[PDB]
């Protein structure tokens, strides 16, 4: 019973033919009604042929016959044409100013969410339209995922490899990154849960690696149910207008400019000079260092950090223990990291994932890894904070949020959401070119890649990265990556220098990494499971020449994790024939 999501006039109708039952002013409702077969309409009641037996729904053919909307079979003498006059008959039957930007709305009122233009528009409409677009989007993606397998756990092997079986004809789970199931432990008569656990692919056979939060254990019979949820209506905009102040309005600069903070201190002034700060970040290049430097920079404000999951907040809480003393910090866990006080926004510093963050209001929160951010969550934040400052961290050039229904076609990182969209309009306000991680080997060349050399050759020349010319004997059986000759070439290319016996194996699919750790003896890491993480000698196999392996940004954020040295066995040629590591052969 509120403003029509298309005309802002206040009304009381709901297109029960869309999934989100919005409000449509009589005019705009009329438009969308005709515009497809969005034919049911929900005001106070079901607009149906409530005429018994009859049930025909569309309004046009519906007929107010006395106190009940009728068809023709039952329609009384005096009756009434509801859908007519170009204006539906509904409450406030006058004050429906109507609108024209409805076509877009209608296609959105119906889209698949699959190809580009879908998301092109989803991220390019107006505010309220994109609000509701995203709402519907998540409705689609979720209800898509409901009829799949329950993981009845047996062979609880090792501390990683629950092995798992299933309910036979029902499981359809992929395994890398994080795929959350909630474990139910078989208890007397009902079912009590165990925690959320995400699972990897995992080396060797059915030994499926797992991971989640919750300090519980697992039991034989602990059946995991594929998680289920219901999206919630947003409200506050994705992005509230920016205002660059005439002061550090509310904040008080700093009495000490720490070296690790000083280069970022340069920024730490003008951040109080505007409501919120937009930043491009070279991967991990003192990102958490930037934030903590601003924290000790403004030691007065309730400074909140939020990211995707506890995994981007991993290094964050690390940097907290680094320089944010355990006093003025709160660490929060849902039902992972709670090193500080569980649940206290009443805190100088408050560390969280957007999901574990409820509504709040303070001064500054960091809003990070925006290459994985959505205007959905870009609203969820404003729909949870009114703090004096936000700050916007990440180059859209890094990765996507895993658009799992973005099928045919891709997306421009800008379109990953309106910040990313505007971050490709306005670029950075501030920046972390300080490659506090990689030597010049990676930095110079991978800056020539797409940053366009904007990464100063940071430290020195390690060079111990090997672009080894591979051809590509890569396999994927059912959904598991395996590549026996690249398995064995990353193997032997380690062998003719044995002492490298230290590195974790990294793969686009930790199934390729799985069977590698099944032939290597080396640990596992996704190319995805990357930021924060970084080993001295890190190996990666270009494996399958897919976009999930060979782009700029995927192995870009997985390429600045090279603190000293990388190996890469390239079935792929461009970055071989473009990027300038040490060129190496093929045992």
Partner 1 sequence: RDAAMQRKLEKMADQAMTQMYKQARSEDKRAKVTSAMQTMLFTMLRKLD
Among residues 33, 109, 111, 208, which is the contact residue for Zn ion, using CB under 5 A?
A: 109
Residue 69 CB, nearest approach to partner 1 (Å): 11
Backbone interruptions in the chain following residues (C to N > 2.5 Å): 335
Site for partner 1 in 40-99 (CB under 8 A): 43-44, 64, 66-67, 78, 80, 89, 91, 93
Cβ within 8 Å of residue 405, ≥6 positions away: 113, 114, 140, 141, 144
Determine the interface stretch with Zn ion among 43-51, 59-67, 469-477, 578-586 (rule: CB under 5 A).
43-51
Binder of residue 74, out of partner 1, Zn ion, none (CB less than 5 to 8 A by kind): Zn ion
Nearer to Zn ion, 16 or 472 (CB): 16
CA distances from 371 to 288, 411, 413, 423, 533 (A): 16, 12, 7, 10, 18
Residue 359 CB, nearest approach to partner 1 (Å): 19
Instruction: Give the single-character DSSP code of 196.
Output: E
Residue 97 CB, nearest approach to Zn ion (Å): 7
Residue 44 CB, nearest approach to Zn ion (Å): 17
Nearer to Zn ion, 51 or 562 (CB): 51
Nearer to partner 1, 44 or 346 (CB): 44
| Strand locations in 355-510 (E) | 364-367, 389-393, 430-431, 466-469, 475-476, 481-482, 505-507
b/e 546-569 (16+ beta carbons within 10 angstroms → b): beebbbbbbbbbbbbbbbbbbbbb
Nearer to partner 1, 64 or 107 (CB): 64
Binder of residue 51, out of Zn ion, partner 1, none (CB less than 5 to 8 A by kind): Zn ion
Q: Work out whether 201 is an interface residue with Zn ion (CB under 5 A).
A: no
Nearer to partner 1, 12 or 35 (CB): 12
Nearer to partner 1, 80 or 179 (CB): 80
Determine the interface stretch with Zn ion among 11-19, 152-160, 318-326, 544-552 (rule: CB under 5 A).
11-19
Half-sphere exposure of 485 (CA within 13 A, CB side): 10
Size (the chain), residues = 587
Cα–Cα distance between 133 and 415 in angstroms, integer? 14
CA distances from 289 to 123, 192, 265, 435, 449 (A): 31, 41, 11, 12, 25
Among residues 13, 14, 25, 493, which is the contact residue for Zn ion, using CB under 5 A?
A: 25
Binder of residue 7, out of Zn ion, partner 1, none (CB less than 5 to 8 A by kind): Zn ion
**CA R_g for the chain:** 27
Cα–Cα distance between 58 and 81 in angstroms, integer? 12
Binder of residue 256, out of Zn ion, partner 1, none (CB less than 5 to 8 A by kind): none
CB-CB contact of 356 with 304 (8 Å): no
Binding site for partner 1 (CB under 8 A): 1, 12, 43-44, 64, 66-67, 78, 80, 89, 91, 93
Binding site for Zn ion (CB under 5 A): 4, 6-7, 15, 17-18, 25, 28, 38, 49, 51, 54, 71, 73-74, 109
């Amino acid at each position: 019973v509120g403003a029509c999501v298309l005309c802002n006039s206040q009304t009381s109708l709901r297109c029960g033919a869309c999934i989100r039952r919005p409000f449509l002013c009589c005019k705009c409702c009329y438009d969308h009604v005709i515009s497809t077969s969005h034919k049911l309409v929900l005001s106070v009641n079901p607009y149906v042929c409530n005429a018994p037996g009859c049930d025909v729904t569309d309004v046009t053919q519906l007929y107010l016959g006395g106190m009940s909307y009728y068809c023709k079979s039952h329609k009384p003498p005096i009756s009434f044409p509801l859908c007519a006059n170009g204006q539906v008959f509904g409450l406030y039957k006058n004050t429906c100013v109507g609108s024209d930007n409805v076509t877009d709305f209608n296609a959105i009122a119906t889209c698949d969410w699959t190809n580009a233009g879908d998301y092109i528009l989803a991220n390019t409409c107006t505010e309220r339209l994109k609000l509701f677009a995203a709402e519907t989007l998540k409705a689609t993606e979720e209800t898509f995922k409901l009829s799949y397998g329950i993981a009845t756990v047996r062979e609880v092997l090792s501390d990683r490899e629950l092995h798992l079986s299933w309910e036979v004809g029902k499981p359809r789970p992929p395994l890398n990154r994080n795929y959350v199931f909630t474990g139910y432990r078989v208890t007397k008569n009902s079912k009590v849960q165990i925690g959320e656990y995400t699972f990897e692919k995992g080396d060797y056979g059915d030994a499926v690696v797992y991971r989640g939060t919750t300090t519980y254990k697992l039991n034989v019979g602990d059946y995991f149910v594929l998680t289920s949820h219901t999206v919630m209506p947003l409200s506050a905009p994705t992005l509230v207008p920016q205002e660059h102040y005439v002061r550090i309005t509310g904040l008080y600069p700093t009495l000490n400019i720490s070296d690790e903070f000083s280069s970022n201190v340069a920024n730490y002034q003008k951040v109080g000079m505007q409501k919120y700060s937009t930043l491009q970040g070279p991967p991990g290049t003192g990102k958490s260092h930037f934030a903590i430097g601003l924290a000790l920079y403004y030691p007065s404000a309730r400074i909140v950090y939020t990211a995707c999951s506890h995994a981007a907040v991993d290094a964050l809480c690390e940097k907290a223990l680094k320089y944010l003393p355990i006093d003025k910090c709160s660490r929060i866990i849902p039902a992972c990291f709670d090193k500080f006080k569980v649940n206290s926004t009443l805190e100088q510093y408050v560390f969280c994932t957007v999901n574990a963050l409820p509504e709040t209001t303070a001064d500054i929160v960091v809003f990070d890894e925006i290459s994985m951010a959505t205007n959905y969550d870009l609203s969820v934040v404003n729909a949870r904070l009114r703090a004096k400052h936000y700050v916007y961290i990440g180059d859209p050039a890094q990765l996507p949020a895993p658009r799992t229904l973005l099928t045919k076609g891709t997306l421009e990182p800008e379109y990953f959401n309106s910040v990313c969209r505007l971050m490709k309009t306005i670029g950075p306000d501030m920046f972390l070119g300080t490659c506090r991680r990689c030597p010049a080997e990676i930095v110079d060349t991978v800056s020539a890649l797409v940053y366009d050399n904007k990464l100063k050759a940071h430290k020195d020349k390690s060079a111990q990265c090997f672009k080894m010319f591979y051809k590509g004997v890569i396999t994927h059986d059912v959904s598991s990556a395996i590549n026996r000759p690249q398995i064995g070439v990353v193997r032997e290319f380690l062998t003719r220098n044995p002492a490298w016996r230290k590195a974790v194996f990294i793969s686009p699919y930790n199934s390729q990494n799985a069977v590698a750790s099944k032939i290597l003896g080396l640990p596992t890491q996704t190319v995805d499971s990357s930021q924060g993480s970084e080993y001295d000698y890190v190996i990666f196999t270009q494996t399958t020449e897919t976009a999930h392996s060979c782009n700029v940004n995927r192995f870009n954020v997985a390429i600045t994790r090279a603190k000293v040295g990388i190996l890469c066995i390239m079935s792929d040629r461009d970055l071989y024939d473009k990027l300038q590591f040490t060129s190496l052969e093929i045992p």
